[PDB]
Design a protein around this ligand. Structure first.
Ligand SMILES: *[C@@H]1O[C@H](CO)[C@@H](O[C@@H]2O[C@H](CO)[C@@H](O)[C@H](O)[C@H]2NC(C)=O)[C@H](O)[C@H]1NC(C)=O
Ligand SMILES: *[C@@H]1O[C@H](CO)[C@@H](O[C@@H]2O[C@H](CO)[C@@H](O)[C@H](O)[C@H]2NC(C)=O)[C@H](O)[C@H]1NC(C)=O
Ligand SMILES: *[C@@H]1O[C@H](CO)[C@@H](O[C@@H]2O[C@H](CO)[C@@H](O)[C@H](O)[C@H]2NC(C)=O)[C@H](O)[C@H]1NC(C)=O
Ligand SMILES: *[C@@H]1O[C@H](CO)[C@@H](O[C@@H]2O[C@H](CO)[C@@H](O)[C@H](O)[C@H]2NC(C)=O)[C@H](O)[C@H]1NC(C)=O
Ligand SMILES: *[C@@H]1O[C@H](CO)[C@@H](O[C@@H]2O[C@H](CO)[C@@H](O)[C@H](O)[C@H]2NC(C)=O)[C@H](O)[C@H]1NC(C)=O
Ligand SMILES: *[C@@H]1O[C@H](CO)[C@@H](O)[C@H](O)[C@H]1NC(C)=O
Ligand SMILES: *[C@@H]1O[C@H](CO)[C@@H](O)[C@H](O)[C@H]1NC(C)=O
Lengths: 50, 50, 99, 49, 170
């Protein structure tokens, strides 16, 4: 299929209308970030020549 | 087959036709010695960085 | 930068070879339509909100903070005066209560 | 798949190490990929090559 | 197509696998980059048919319906001014899709300010949105409301100058 970019929304804009939230939701979301790799050391002489 | 290592007893169930074992690096991991036909495990001698 | 929404605080959690951030954010909900005006005309003076926004529930005009509907009576304490009513486009007529 | 980034880092490091290990099994045009075989089979003039 | 050459290349092991893997990593990273830059909204916003934004003119940046590509005049100018076993992989997002992302972002910021970036899109008149932004930089609302025509004219002239500067600079 041709992928959909998102749900269609037509914001009801006019020159004298505003939307004010009457409530709220406390949202908790995760963010995963790598910090370090595995510290590997390669003995070049022993790798190449044993 | 020439190499260096520590030879210990092994509990790997070698089938009768199987002679030796191999790791990913293609080095010998186990061996069946002649004149005894018993399966020997080969482990590399201790090494590391100083 | 710290989650989706208006960021409140974040909590760090240790992970193998990384960190996980629990981003606590404020997300507005249950919005309502209102009629709004840039300024209120009263006694030939233009009144603008100090911190909020002028909203009308259909018949009466209030001033509420912008992120949460908390309507209040338009007074001289929550509004400031700047000029007359002949300059601002869209200024509407209503009384401004004096405490 | 929630922790995909850390698992991707771990997989890439382990895969690079495994590829490096597997490269020891290639002979690169030599008669054998085992140094011990070459040393126990050839004199130094050709074993050197 | 040489069989002998491939037989000799088999001696070198998995070098080709490493090269292909690295190039595949780069290729998927490009699509990921485009997703992070442009796919920041899950809602495709549209501007109202009437372009009454208190005198502010966004024609040079809003999509041109007449063009087949649905690109803005500035975007059209930008796309006009930028011109053996080797394959070029097409990007995951087409130019039309990226332009639709930019149109959604423009419609969201014009019709709802910054509210759509933190939750549901809350409509606000554009002179009042710019008055909020004036408060953000330490300038009172009345400064904007009493100078709204002048600010709109300056903004329109600045956008036109942006188009002219892009067109006339190589
Ligand atoms: C505020 O009012 C507008 C119009 O009075 C509402 O917009 C309409 O919403 C319905 C329901 O989805 C749609 O079918 C119409 O097409 C919308 N009209 C326009 C012009 O966009 C809007 O939903 C109202 N907002 C709230 C929070 O009630
Ligand atoms: C604001 O939204 C919250 C939900 O986030 C509403 O709280 C719910 O209220 C109903 C009925 O009052 C209860 O059955 C739910 O259990 C409540 N949910 C939670 C999580 O407590 C709250 O009523 C809403 N307030 C307004 C003014 O709309
Ligand atoms: C807009 O809000 C005002 C104040 O909240 C409403 O005025 C009150 O309406 C109630 C309900 O009928 C009456 O009992 C009060 O006496 C009213 N107070 C005043 C000072 O008039 C008003 O009705 C609301 N308008 C709409 C259309 O909802
Ligand atoms: C807001 O109030 C002002 C003054 O109370 C109104 O201005 C008057 O308008 C009438 C007819 O439009 C004129 O005859 C008066 O001379 C005006 N007076 C002044 C002092 O300008 C204005 O029309 C009102 N606006 C609305 C929308 O009702
Ligand atoms: C917004 O700006 C555009 C272009 O800057 C205006 O379009 C011009 O309109 C005049 C007459 O209305 C024409 O002579 C020009 O040729 C148009 N230019 C282009 C590039 O189309 C437009 O009128 C402005 N105003 C509105 C409300 O859209
Ligand atoms: C000699 O080697 C054979 C294997 O070829 C084995 O069967 C036999 O037991 C060995 N004899 C001695 C005396 O070790
Ligand atoms: C909004 O537009 C209407 C026409 O649709 C006009 O009568 C009114 O004066 C406008 N208000 C503002 C504040 O521009």
């Amino acid at each position: 299929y041709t992928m959909s970019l998102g749900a269609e929304n037509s914001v009801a804009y006019s020159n004298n209308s505003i939307a004010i939230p009457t409530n709220f939701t406390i949202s908790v979301t995760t963010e995963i970030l790598p910090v370090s790799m595995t510290k590997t050391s390669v003995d070049c002489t022993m790798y190449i020549c044993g | 087959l020439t190499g260096t290592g520590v030879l210990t007893e092994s509990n790997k169930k070698f089938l009768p036709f199987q002679q030796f074992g191999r790791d990913i690096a293609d080095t010998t991991d186990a061996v069946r010695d002649p004149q005894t036909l018993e399966i020997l495990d080969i482990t590399p001698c201790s090494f590391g960085g100083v | 930068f710290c989650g989706k929404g208006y960021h409140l605080m974040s909590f760090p959690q240790s992970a193998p070879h990384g960190v996980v951030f629990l981003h606590v954010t404020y997300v507005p909900a249950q919005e309502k339509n209102f009629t709004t005006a840039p300024a209120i005309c009263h006694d030939g003076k233009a009144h603008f909100p100090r911190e909020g926004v002028f909203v009308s529930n259909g018949t009466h005009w209030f001033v509420t903070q912008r992120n949460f509907y908390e309507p209040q009576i338009i007074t001289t304490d929550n509004t400031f005066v700047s000029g007359n009513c002949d300059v601002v486009i869209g200024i509407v007529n209503n009384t401004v209560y004096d405490p | 798949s929630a922790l995909g980034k850390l698992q991707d880092v771990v997989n890439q490091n382990a895969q690079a190490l495994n590829t490096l290990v597997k490269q020891l099994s290639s002979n690169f045009g030599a008669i054998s990929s085992v140094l011990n075989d070459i040393l126990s089979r050839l004199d130094p003039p050709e074993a050197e090559v | 197509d040489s069989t002998e050459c491939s037989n000799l290349l088999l001696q070198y092991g998995s070098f080709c696998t490493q090269l292909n893997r690295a190039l595949t990593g780069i290729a998927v990273e490009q699509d990921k980059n485009t997703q992070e830059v442009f796919a920041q909204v899950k809602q495709i916003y549209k501007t109202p048919p009437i372009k009454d934004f208190g005198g502010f003119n966004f024609s040079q940046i809003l999509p041109d319906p007449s063009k087949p590509s649905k690109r803005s005049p500035i975007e059209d100018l930008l796309f006009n001014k930028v011109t053996n076993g080797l394959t070029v992989l097409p990007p995951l997002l087409t130019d039309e899709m990226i332009a639709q992302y930019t149109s959604a972002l423009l419609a969201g910021t014009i019709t709802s300010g910054w509210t759509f970036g933190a939750g549901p899109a809350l409509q606000i008149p554009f002179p009042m949105q710019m008055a909020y932004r004036f408060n953000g930089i330490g300038v009172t609302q009345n400064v904007l409301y009493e100078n709204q025509k002048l600010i709109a004219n300056q903004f329109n002239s600045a956008i036109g100058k942006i188009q002219d500067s892009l067109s006339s600079t190589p």
